[PDB]
Design a protein around this ligand. Structure first.
Ligand code: NAD
Ligand code: NAD
Ligand code: NAD
Ligand code: NAD
Lengths: 330, 329, 330, 330
């Protein structure tokens, strides 16, 4: 019976009752490739993982039979798809799982930067008897008006359009940018489209990031692109870790080029405010890689990722996979 | 020349140049009425106050030359408009100053409750190693999906429509209750309207107040209405704070009947978090009466109040005031 | 029992079994005060009319006490409310009845003017071979792009907001002008508000009227105002008829100052297309006063009028009515 | 550069001054391909067509020096892309121009059916005196309320999206059907997605077609699918013709199984109401294939087409073209 792993899992109680008989779901609870067991590394047909354990070219052959790797999530950047596509390993993922959640959390980070609700709550929990109206503006100094602030968006993916759809009502003027979309969407959703990155950086006040991390955009917003940002433009990042540089963003925050920046995923997981380059950065919000989560987007991505193992444990691989992301498979 | 006394503020550097020639502006900076200078109480004809000092009839009858009270904001509930009009004191206000900002900071409250982006930032400031994806769900246990929830707006004026317009895009099925509103505008915006609280609290996964406190809405959400909300339904209150029994909302939070509640204004300002009726409440966000503020909205709001006294120290009161609020003088 | 007229109706079908118990509905099908019978003049408690009969100060006094008149529809300009207010007669309308069918029809007119769909269907039912792509362009010559026009709504009540909500998605940039609205209704919906009619007519590619015809705007768009309109801007009147000049608009059409005009009402109804001041004007759409009709807009306003004549037959006068439109009695 | 033809046109006015230094544009006026030439047909270089002259396998073989085809439309059904690649020819189209016009004519064909602002204008262009409201309710008997109807649009591509953005404000509830989209698009715009076409026709008060016409779409609407539509649901075809079996749509109207149909293209073009399979159908509005036209989109698509041929006669085989088609190229 085809043992199906749950590599970085401890809770297999949604993938069990639908893989109850086709396979023996058995987690590994790993945090490193050298923390999986020999039983799984020698007999585990499929392995649904999460966004924490990272597999590399030299780890995909550290298995003995790995027909499929389902990524319970919207992004396959921690799996070397080009190695799996030649090691006889298809790599699925659940793209549509949390799109109305990443977009809500992103359009909430933008409002938490513009209106300073999180900083106000935090400065009210530290204790601040803010009573006089001259004493309110000194605790909300910077809370800007939204109507008419051009919103960059580096990439109309599924979760890039889902933010341009609900940020057009707040008054934002959206202008996306990504070179891989066909001439198109810019017209059907009613957003301007800039063709080169310098433009999106030069004419945007709240540059966001919604692009999947491939090998051509690693460290997209480094020190060289930050100097192209408008003077005092927020920077929300809910896409992926190695996308925005860290030392450079900290530098830009300390000086003042960035009037605030609410990262949501960091270059070093798990993030904390006591280690790393952002140790002393001002005007910085960070959530612990929680914009994909809800009570119904987990129950929907785990279910739909176990249904993906079901399809690959009976059907032909990879011609019976609803979401494979390497058709460079052999 | 007439004296125009700003009641609570050490800053008059926006309305001074707009009111330089006509009158002589002179701030008073009074956290209460017992700090008004005798000059600015015996010789001031016009007077603009923000929201902190509250003029009652026993107090509005002490100014002996006052002829207009420009109320900076959408408030005027801390000014006894009946008594004011009975003393020849026309009260106006600036209603359109911060609408696109109260609505934007009310939507952010609704999203900070549904996705918990300010309880996660806290848990990261308190220090929490959120490493394993089993711990992500334990630190964010409660974050919900928005598409489908029914947002119920008690009050559909300006700040109520401005939230229905921008919450219809997140999938929030909007629903409102407004008795004083001449029917036929739930048709334009496209939102179902209900006709009684017992019929709005009953179907609303996130009730948000947007009414103006008058002599008939005090403690609208009291101990008797919270027993009509759903079994767990967020409550946002970015509108004047004498609308929720704080001795009955904290009794519902510490019990689980309300799954969190972001209050923007309270009954007692300032709002020292450790002091008050809800000192020990769980799942509670509070900003300090700061949805109205913006570098641009706190300037349009003051220039347009200077311009209002420029019209009252020159025109016929109250037939010259652009938007007076007590034409019962 | 009290008699409840139906001054111009000939159905009294939906209104019959709502007040049959406590009133005897009876229709008259009149077109003037020259058709009503003697006893149903002075004592007839209530009457409910449509937009076809015009009652005047010199007519309502032929009714001693119409304890109520109910104006099925949304406009109460047929009856002198200032006259009824002095003869103990309270006027009522049904405002919320067809607020969105009027907006859908007004958007349909604005799109018929831009895309020329009903000028192309009419040029096909008239016979035209449109084979070559040159003739496609010479027959639909005038159709314009919509994204980036400045639709200007003269009047921002219910039917104005309902169009500003619907036309903000087509790319229009709404710009209204309303002198009676309080400050702020332009900040909630996000539509730039201009304050003087010249300032709305200068910057507008469509000037669609949505104001109720009161005493102070009869013939609002006359020759003088049309001379202020932008060179070649459409004009969609879907409001009361006597609001826009006939002769002046026909002049502006035949001349070129107006690139089309879809009028849903006219100065003199029933509007025939061969007798009138618009006898030979080019580029007109017209509809026979039908933007309020549906299979549901009727059952919602007729029932609502039948309910208004109950609320006004068991309860006291206008302090027990719902949509009273002249509180000016005493 | 060699002669670039303009097969389907008599006017090369904006294509030329952009191509004046590269090649010498000429035209052919071919209403059919056997009407082009014996010398251009031999050795031009390439071409740029419109949507009337169809080029088939046996006909593309007739050209002897064809490098590139450049449609000036949005679709390329009238060219055997699958055969043109095997022949040595690259095919290209201007994909995103008049996306804002097809989706403004489709939201007008949809309101022209729910409000009948083009049948009311017809019936009033024939002399239907309508003063009594009991007669207005007759001339417009059939107009319906929109808020609630479930507009179900086949093919959520580039205009299928631009229509679901415009018709989410009228109250429509949009649901699409598309089997070639990588799932996750129904959640960015908030439109419920159905998976089988029967599941789109069983719940749609107004079905609208927005799909390509490749090979598995011919007569998507048969006598076998119309039997699956709601009892009297409109049908708006503003896509390529050959998706609606006219012989079946001419029955579905003469019985009431379809309460209206706003076709914009047709099986055989040109179109006229006196020769065809639907010569006598009631409730049938049809425009002559001008849902794509404007004064700006018909200048944008025929400049982008003259730029995509400059890039193709200066660049390379389909590695320099921007919007190339036919991965069947060698
Ligand atoms: N906060 C979270 O934890 C969370 C949750 C869900 C998704 N995500 C991330 O969001 C990312 C985007 O999600 P998605 O649904 O849009 O994936 P997607 O494949 O559907 O869309 C990504 C699009 O980004 C554009 N793009 C690609 N490379 C680019 C580049 N170098 N520069 C600019 N644009 C580029 C492309 O147009 C791509 O289509 C995912 O990779 C995923 O990792 C994060
Ligand atoms: N967070 C802040 O500091 C802030 C900023 C701006 C406004 N506000 C408050 O928000 C309130 C609303 O602002 P606004 O611009 O909408 O004023 P508004 O008068 O235009 O809107 C009030 C609407 O609620 C209706 N209403 C009255 N009593 C009601 C009741 N008992 N139940 C339900 N509805 C009732 C009112 O008739 C009206 O429809 C203002 O009183 C203002 O004090 C607060
Ligand atoms: N096509 C139809 O048959 C049809 C259907 C419904 C309504 N209508 C007409 O549409 C009119 C408007 O409908 P409504 O429900 O919005 O009425 P409404 O009273 O609800 O709103 C009308 C708004 O226009 C304002 N206004 C008044 N005079 C003005 C002027 N001189 N210039 C600019 N604005 C002015 C009014 O103050 C108000 O703000 C109604 O009077 C009604 O007669 C026509
Ligand atoms: N009225 C006009 O003259 C006019 C103007 C512009 C475009 N069009 C036509 O409209 C069509 C759509 O335009 P577009 O820009 O969206 O093309 P597109 O390729 O961008 O979008 C087409 C979408 O429909 C999908 N589809 C394919 N077959 C399908 C099927 N059997 N059922 C359901 N969906 C299917 C396609 O995969 C795609 O998702 C074009 O083919 C074009 O020919 C017509």
């Amino acid at each position: 019976r085809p043992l199906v792993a749950l590599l970085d899992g401890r809770d297999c109680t949604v993938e069990m009752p639908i893989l109850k008989d086709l396979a023996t779901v058995a987690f590994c609870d790993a945090q490193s490739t050298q923390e999986i067991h020999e039983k799984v590394l020698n007999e585990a047909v499929g392995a649904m993982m999460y966004h924490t354990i990272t597999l590399t070219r030299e780890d995909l052959e550290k298995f003995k039979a790995l027909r499929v790797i389902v990524r319970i999530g919207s992004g396959y950047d921690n799996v070397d798809i080009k190695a799996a596509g030649e090691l006889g390993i298809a790599v699925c993922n659940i793209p549509s799982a949390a799109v109305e959640e990443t977009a809500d959390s992103t359009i909430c980070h933008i409002l938490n930067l513009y209106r300073r609700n999180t900083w106000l709550y935090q400065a009210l929990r530290e204790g601040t008897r803010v009573q006089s109206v001259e004493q309110i503006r000194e605790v909300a100094s910077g809370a800007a008006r939204i109507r008419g602030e051009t919103l960059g968006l580096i990439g109309f993916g599924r979760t890039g359009q889902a933010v341009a759809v609900r940020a057009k009502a707040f008054g934002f003027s959206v202008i996306f940018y990504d070179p891989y979309l066909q001439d198109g969407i810019e017209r059907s959703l009613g957003v301007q489209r800039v063709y080169t990155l310098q433009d999106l950086l030069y004419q945007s006040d709240c540059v966001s990031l919604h692009c999947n991390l491939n090998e051509h955009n690693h460290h997209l917003i480094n020190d060289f692109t930050i100097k192209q940002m408008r003077q005092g433009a927020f920077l929300v990042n809910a896409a992926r870790g190695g996308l925005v540089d860290e030392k450079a963003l900290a530098q830009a925050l300390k000086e003042g080029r960035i009037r605030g920046a609410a990262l949501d995923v960091h270059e070093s997981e798990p993030f904390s405010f006591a280690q790393g380059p952002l140790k002393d950065a001002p005007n910085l919000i960070c959530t612990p890689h929680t914009a994909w989560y809800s009570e119904q987007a987990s129950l929907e991505m785990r279910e739909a990722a176990a249904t993906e193992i079901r399809r690959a444990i009976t059907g032909r691989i990879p011609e019976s996979l609803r979401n494979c992301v390497n058709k460079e498979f052999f």
